[PDB]
Amino acid sequence: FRALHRRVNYPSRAKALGVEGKVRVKFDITGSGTVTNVQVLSETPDGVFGDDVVKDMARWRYRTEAPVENQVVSIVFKLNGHIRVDDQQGSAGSAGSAGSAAAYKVTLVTPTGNVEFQCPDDVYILDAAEEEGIDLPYSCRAGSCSSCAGKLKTGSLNQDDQSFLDDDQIDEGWVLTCAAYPVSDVTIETHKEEELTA
Amino acid sequence: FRALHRRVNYPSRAKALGVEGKVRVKFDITGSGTVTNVQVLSETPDGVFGDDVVKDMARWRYRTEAPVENQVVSIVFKLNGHIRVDDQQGSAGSAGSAGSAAAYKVTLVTPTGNVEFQCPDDVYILDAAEEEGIDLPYSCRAGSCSSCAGKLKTGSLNQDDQSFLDDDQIDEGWVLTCAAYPVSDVTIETHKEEELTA
Numbered sequence: 001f002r003a004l005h006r007r008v009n010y011p012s013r014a015k016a017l018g019v020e021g022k023v024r025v026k027f028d029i030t031g032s033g034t035v036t037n038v039q040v041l042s043e044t045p046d047g048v049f050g051d052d053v054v055k056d057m058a059r060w061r062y063r064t065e066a067p068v069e070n071q072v073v074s075i076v077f078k079l080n081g082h083i084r085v086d087d088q089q090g091s092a093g094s095a096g097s098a099g100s101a102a103a104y105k106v107t108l109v110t111p112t113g114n115v116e117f118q119c120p121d122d123v124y125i126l127d128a129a130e131e132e133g134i135d136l137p138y139s140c141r142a143g144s145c146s147s148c149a150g151k152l153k154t155g156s157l158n159q160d161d162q163s164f165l166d167d168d169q170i171d172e173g174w175v176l177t178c179a180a181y182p183v184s185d186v187t188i189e190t191h192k193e194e195e196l197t198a
Numbered sequence: 199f200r201a202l203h204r205r206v207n208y209p210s211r212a213k214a215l216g217v218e219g220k221v222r223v224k225f226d227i228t229g230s231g232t233v234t235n236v237q238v239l240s241e242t243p244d245g246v247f248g249d250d251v252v253k254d255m256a257r258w259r260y261r262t263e264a265p266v267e268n269q270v271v272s273i274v275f276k277l278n279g280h281i282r283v284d285d286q287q288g289s290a291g292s293a294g295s296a297g298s299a300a301a302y303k304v305t306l307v308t309p310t311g312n313v314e315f316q317c318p319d320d321v322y323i324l325d326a327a328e329e330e331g332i333d334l335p336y337s338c339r340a341g342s343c344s345s346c347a348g349k350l351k352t353g354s355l356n357q358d359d360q361s362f363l364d365d366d367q368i369d370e371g372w373v374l375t376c377a378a379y380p381v382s383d384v385t386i387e388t389h390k391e392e393e394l395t396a
């Protein structure tokens with residue numbers, strides 16, 4: 001089971017406007033490996049990337065032994081033509097269920113001051129920060145490096161999807177923000193990569 | 199089957215020396231999820247990161263239904279405490295087999311001029327360029343973005359491990375250098391991300 005072809009085109013209007021952006025989208029895969037049941041979960045900013053991404057996804061291809069439901073990706077667009085497609089985890093809410101995920105208030109303590117936003121319980125800290133237009137560090141986006149490291153000051157997180165931290169570090173409050181969901185209101189100090197690996 | 203804890207520490211001597219680096223290492227996983235049969239494949243530069251990485255890997259943890267052989271990761275160390283662990287694909291050669299993989303000459307045509315090095319048939323273009331001390335762009339390292347894009351001018355590649363390019367783009371000569379192996383001598387123009395997604 002794996003992706004074969006997942007091309008995304010860069011919308012010329014975004015390029016022209018000098019807009020960076022982000023789409024999170026859910027889809028199913030058929031036993032033939034084609035993509036259907038596509039639903040945009042979020043698009044930042046709105047009306048620039050979503051429609052084009054859905055069009056592109058019609059031509060995606062996977063290899064699979066059976067249909068697969070409720071896949072989710074993040075599609076990030078940055079300056080100078082950069083696009084990346086990152087796999088995330090589907091939830092009841094991503095699949096299109098009735099009602100809204102519980103959401104919690106995230107307080108980030110950043111080198112340039114504090115910021116606060118809502119984060120659904122099925123969205124990673126990083127993603128919700130990006131949706132609020134905050135620029136947090138990252139590189140792998142796969143819970144497998146130090147880039148997105150922060151320190152949890154209060155509250156509780158689910159970091160089941162991370163892997164670069166050991167037991168000890170999690171217990172000491174370390175967080176990989178690309179792979180962590182809030183399960184309460186939380187306060188996280190960001191930009192702590194260098195402190196993590198020291 | 200998945201990684202749970204893969205902590206790597208930053209060697210203080212590397213920090214002090216202002217050295218960036220890279221280790222590629224093979225290991226097996228036990229049915230208990232512990233790591234054994236560890237062998238460094240390459241370390242750049244030598245004698246700075248390898249021994250410490252092997253020590254760290256003794257404490258790694260996986261979840262698994264059965265033992266798994268001949269896993270390989272790349273471990274990259276950059277300035278300001280950055281470490282990332284990226285999964286790659288094992289080969290006869292990574293497992294420790296007799297004799298050497300066939301190797302091919304890679305010619306890179308970079309914005310700052312041309313460079314040439316050997317690349318084994320079981321090592322990705324990006325990795326071999328990094329081992330030769332060339333700084334090529336990348337971000338996901340998972341064949342799922344535009345960052346490492348180049349244009350294949352001559353020769354042939356295996357890009358089975360990539361997924362962001364479609365059929366058409368591969369046929370036109372596009373290459374994701376983080377996920378491409380040479381199967382002949384090749385010439386690749388690098389730094390073509392913006393041209394790819396345009």
Ligand code: FES
Pocket residue numbers: 137138139140141142143144145146147148149164176177178179
């Ligand atoms: S960006 Fe690598 S662990 Fe979050």
Ligand code: FES
Pocket residue numbers: 335336337338339340341342343344345346347362374375376377
């Ligand atoms: S770095 Fe993303 S495809 Fe190579």
Ligand SMILES: [K+]
Pocket residue numbers: 028037069
């Ligand atoms: K379905």
Ligand SMILES: [K+]
Pocket residue numbers: 226235267
């Ligand atoms: K073994």
Ligand code: NI
Pocket residue numbers: 167168171
């Ligand atoms: Ni613990």
Ligand code: NI
Pocket residue numbers: 365366369
């Ligand atoms: Ni073709």
